[PDB]
């Protein structure tokens, strides 16, 4: 009936739909609790994260730091690869990726600096060469500076500051927390009270207004109580702002209008504890003595219901839902708790089903960060001198293999990272582009689908001695390094190591990883690639008929899976964009890499036409339809290569 490249395109379409059906956060963090962890040694080939490099703080600021009289502070601009240090009324920026960095200083400030942040500019205010706005809060003023982080030319973004003649009186309320929205709104808060302030700024000079203003969105009357803020948090996908107080009160504000901000929820610790009590499992790790030390908003693209994660100082992660009564939310509820892991960090390896709700391995948690799709960093301050870093990620493999929906739990992969003693962690920021496998909760967290489209997540960890770089490790990275441990090792040692992957990720995912590593994906490298190739052959399975109808081998599914993931960004995409005669949808450099990747795959198939079962010509119906399906896939590849080669020719 159907021609070859058409049958293959059907498999690709179905495969795309499979990856985009990866469970959403709401469905494996259902009401209840979990303590599901598989811990991994930091040096293991299975480690979910690892340190990749460290950048020492340049000596010229160590001199300035000791020249400090009253106040000093450090901070991170991880999205452009810059760090900063303030000493009293002086500020210093530098690129930490650079080996002998120049200091970009700003010493115009008259009073002590208390907070600085890097925020998007308001549209239609500045010239287009200004990528960001630098907000500098002192005890006297809030100062705005123009910033251009344009990429001249090799490592980090060359950085220049511009004065703006925009400054507001600081007022009576301290500023320690500055956050910005997508559209350049600037919100402020601090340690004097719970009030949230916003800075407006304009292009024009008007007689009745000013270029630069500051208003208080909170307005309290008389009758106050001592309470101040611990952090401010923006969620642009829902136009929400969250504050966290010292009493562990969580307040939610809605940006209903372009200049309006409205408190719509106030949830104190008591409410969280009442919610927690009505859960089937209470615990000594969460009481009225416990503090919430950090929040991390969850975007609407990752989950519909779960809005927010809160970290306790005992290491519990609280996941809170929020619903409208009908839009802004009006209610917030503690639904799900992820309790701490049990294993503590050790020097010597140690010998490895009920809910563990009493672990103290994360007690005390001083700092905490969550990044999509669930990368968790916890700064555990067990000793007053050195921090231990607990880092976990969703066990994506087991999560997507799990069946049925009711069996879904929040499975995780974790590890402890020790940055050598005596240095305190200050901040942790994302250096790469925000993760997202899909545009809706379903399919959003599928790391497996994007391990060849996206750079693995990298994270800058700022301490008082330097910036450490932590990188997420993908399936292919783990599979490659594990094979690296099988080179010198035995024959039936590979079979052993492969079965570990199969029991976790599933046969198809495992073989797809072997294929990828055989094609040069992955973190002697030739021995590893040959080993991956061997696994792809010996463990790929075979076609069989069910109960006419045939079930293809895992080797075939693996191939369709790998090919699909290489072209997933452009498959359903329009080839061009038209405004009146113009653009190409997918960039020129990405089409080249996609092409190179596909041609690598094709090459691997030809270079092993003889030994790959089903490639050479051929119980029978099984092996024959296996042969037909593989042929169809190969005709699609050369068609993909031709097609891309054609579009590159068009815009040439």
């Amino acid at each position: 009936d159907l021609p070859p490249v058409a049958k293959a395109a059907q498999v690709v379409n179905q495969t795309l739909q499979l990856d985009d059906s990866y469970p959403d956060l709401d469905s494996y963090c259902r009401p209840g609790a979990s303590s599901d962890y598989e811990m991994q040694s930091s040096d293991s080939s299975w480690a979910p994260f690892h340190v990749v490099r460290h950048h020492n703080i340049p000596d010229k600021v160590f001199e300035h730091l000791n020249a400090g009289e009253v106040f000093t502070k450090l901070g991170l601009f991880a999205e452009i690869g810059y760090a900063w240090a303030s000493i009293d009324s002086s500020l210093f920026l530098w690129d930490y990726t650079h080996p002998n960095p120049e200091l970009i200083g700003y010493e115009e400030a008259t009073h002590t600096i208390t907070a600085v942040a890097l925020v998007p500019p308001k549209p239609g205010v500045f010239v287009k060469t200004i990528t960001h706005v630098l907000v500098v809060a002192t005890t006297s003023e809030i100062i705005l500076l123009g910033v251009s982080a344009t990429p001249t030319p090799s490592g980090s973004k060359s950085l220049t500051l511009y004065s703006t003649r925009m400054s507001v009186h600081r007022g009576g309320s301290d500023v320690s927390f500055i956050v910005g929205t997508k559209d350049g709104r600037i919100f402020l808060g601090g340690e004097s009270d719970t009030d949230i302030h916003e800075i407006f700024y304009q292009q024009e000079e008007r007689w009745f207004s000013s270029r630069c203003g500051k208003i208080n969105h909170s307005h309290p009357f008389g009758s106050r109580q001592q309470e101040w803020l611990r952090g401010l948090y923006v969620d642009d996908t829902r136009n929400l702002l969250y504050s966290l107080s010292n009493r562990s009160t969580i307040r939610t504000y809605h940006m209903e209008g372009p200049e309006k901000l409205t408190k719509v929820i106030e949830k104190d610790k008591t409410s969280c504890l009442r919610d927690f009590a009505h859960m089937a499992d209470s615990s000594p790790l969460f009481t009225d003595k416990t503090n919430i030390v950090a929040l991390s908003p969850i975007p609407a693209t990752e989950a519909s219901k779960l809005h927010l994660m809160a970290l306790t100082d005992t290491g519990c992660r609280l996941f809170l839902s929020a619903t409208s009564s009908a839009l802004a939310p009006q209610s917030m509820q503690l639904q799900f708790v992820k309790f701490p892991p049990r294993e503590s960090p050790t020097r010597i390896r140690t010998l490895n089903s009920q809910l563990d709700k009493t672990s103290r391995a994360l007690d005390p948690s001083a700092l905490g960060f969550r990044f999509s799709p669930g990368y968790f960093f916890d700064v555990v301050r067990k000793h007053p001198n050195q921090d231990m870093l607990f880092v976990s990620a969703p066990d994506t493999g087991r999560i997507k293999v799990t069946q049925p929906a009711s069996a879904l739990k929040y499975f995780e992969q974790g590890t402890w990272i020790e940055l050598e003693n005596g240095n305190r962690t200050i901040e942790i920021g994302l250096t790469t582009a925000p993760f997202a496998a899909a545009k809706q909760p379903l399919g959003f967290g599928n790391e497996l689908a994007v391990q060849f489209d996206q750079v693995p997540g990298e994270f800058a960890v700022l301490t008082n001695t330097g910036v450490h770089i932590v990188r997420r490790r993908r399936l292919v990275d783990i599979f490659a390094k594990a094979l690296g441990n099988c080179v010198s090792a035995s024959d039936d040692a590979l079979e052993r190591e492969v079965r570990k992957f199969i029991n976790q990720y599933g046969r198809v995912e495992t073989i797809a990883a072997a294929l990828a590593v055989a094609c040069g994906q992955g973190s002697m490298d030739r021995n590893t690639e040959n080993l991956a190739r061997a696994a792809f052959i010996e463990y790929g399975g075979q076609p069989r008929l069910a109960a006419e109808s045939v079930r293809l081998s895992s080797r075939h599914d693996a191939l369709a899976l790998y090919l699909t993931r290489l072209v997933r960004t452009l498959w359903k995409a329009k080839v061009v964009q038209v405004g009146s005669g113009s653009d190409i949808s997918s960039t020129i450099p990405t089409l080249v890499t996609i092409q190179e990747n596909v041609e690598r795959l094709r090459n691997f198939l030809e270079a092993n036409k003889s030994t790959i079962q089903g490639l050479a010509p051929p119980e029978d119906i099984a092996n024959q339809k296996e042969h037909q399906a593989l042929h169809a896939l190969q005709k699609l590849m050369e068609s993909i290569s031709e097609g891309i080669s054609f579009v590159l020719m068009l815009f040439d």
């Binding site: 920026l93 500045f126 220049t160 500051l161």
Partner: peptide, 14 residues
């Protein structure tokens, strides 16, 4: 070295 602060004229349009 004190960072050179380029003018507002370039910064904001038009």
């Amino acid at each position: 070295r004190k960072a050179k602060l380029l003018p507002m004229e370039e910064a904001l349009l038009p």
